Design a protein around this ligand. Structure first.
Ligand SMILES: CC(=O)N[C@H]1[C@@H](OP(=O)(O)OP(=O)(O)OC[C@H]2O[C@@H](n3ccc(=O)[nH]c3=O)[C@H](O)[C@@H]2O)O[C@H](CO)[C@H](O)[C@@H]1O
Length: 321
């Protein structure tokens, strides 16, 4: 009999965010070799039939991770390091530390992940790059540069770097910056509203449905991503797999997605460096930076093929049962 997989995701059901997206995608990819279901917490009325658990976020799902560990000591637990666990919490957070100890396998979502784990956790760490469907690379206009950044506004997304680069470029009518994401963390949507009132090339569109978000990523000349940390951001692969090049903060989660040799990084929180890269992208339109970055992004794009992710998850499942 095939395994009965439970995926634990701290996301609300139907949420438009990474943690829901990963859990739903993994359920789809694994369905040909197992019975798969997604929950927010474990156990539940259906818990007795589950044989394997993949739990997202070593802190946020720590109570379900421990429930599983105590019910199945030494068997069937994979803990998936989705971001603030790996790059924040495992530091000093006893829940995140326990989850790391209890897991039979740890999953990181790009090549650099295990560098952030304790050395005693590296032998059971597995890399599972995420995947996304491709979109046709669109030909685009040289008349203007249109940038997009995508992320629900929270401090970890360092939206202030974008706000500050948009402000440096306030008078540049030839450069447009669209920003997609809900107004989560206290007062970030107010900063975005004030900036869009002052600097008409900058627009904060609020949260948009995923279909519309993918279409805007495809249509933009460039995707800007400023975060302090990422587990392995969906929006970077969504751009890459649309033929939209990226400007990203030099933090491990981003470097793991775009490569050690990528020419499109700026130092974390350096608004001037980001504004300089946008000016260089614009200058090149008409040898140009956008073309250089498109070439580099096209070599990354096969990392994000769902067949690749499926094969990595099939291997992981066979290890856990
Ligand atoms: C560490 C961190 O800070 N973020 C992590 C978190 O995802 P996040 O939710 O922080 O970021 P993400 O970019 O991985 O995923 C956001 C998803 O929502 C979509 N979107 C977003 C806003 C909006 O208005 N419309 C829209 O469609 C976007 O297109 C993407 O598919 O979990 C993921 C795994 O599950 C990854 O590990 C991320 O790196």
């Amino acid at each position: 009999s095939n395994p009965s997989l439970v995926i634990v995701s701290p996301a609300l059901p139907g949420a438009n965010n990474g943690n829901w997206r990963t859990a739903q995608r993994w359920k789809a990819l694994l369905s040909p070799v197992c019975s798969a279901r997604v929950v927010q917490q474990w156990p539940d009325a259906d818990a007795s039939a589950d044989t394997v658990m993949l739990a997202l976020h070593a802190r946020r799902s720590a109570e379900s991770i421990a429930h599983w560990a105590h019910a199945h000591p030494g068997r069937g637990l994979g803990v998936v390091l989705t971001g603030t666990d790996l790059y924040q919490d495992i530091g000093s957070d006893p829940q995140a530390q326990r989850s790391l100890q209890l897991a039979q396998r740890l999953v990181v979502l790009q090549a650099l992940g295990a560098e952030a784990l304790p050395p005693e956790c590296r032998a059971k760490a597995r890399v599972v790059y995420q995947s996304t469907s491709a979109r046709a690379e669109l030909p685009k206009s040289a008349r203007q540069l249109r940038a997009v950044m995508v992320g629900h506004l929270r401090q970890v997304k360092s939206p202030q770097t974008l706000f500050d680069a948009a402000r440096l470029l306030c008078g540049r009518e030839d450069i447009r910056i669209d920003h997609i994401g809900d107004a989560g963390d206290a007062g970030l949507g107010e900063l975005a509203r004030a900036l869009a009132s002052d600097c008409p090339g900058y627009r904060w569109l609020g949260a948009l449905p995923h279909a519309q978000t993918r279409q805007r990523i495809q249509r933009a000349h460039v995707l800007v991503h400023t975060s302090a940390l990422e587990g392995g951001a969906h929006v970077i692969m969504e751009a890459v797999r649309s033929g939209t090049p990226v400007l990203a903060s030099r933090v491990p989660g981003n470097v793991g997605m775009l490569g050690n040799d990528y020419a499109g990084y700026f130092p974390h929180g350096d608004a001037a460096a980001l504004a300089a890269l946008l000016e260089a992208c614009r200058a090149g339109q008409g040898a140009g930076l956008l073309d250089s970055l498109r070439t580099q992004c096209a070599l990354r794009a096969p990392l994000f093929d769902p067949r690749a992710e499926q094969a990595a998850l099939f291997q992981l499942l066979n290890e856990l049962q």
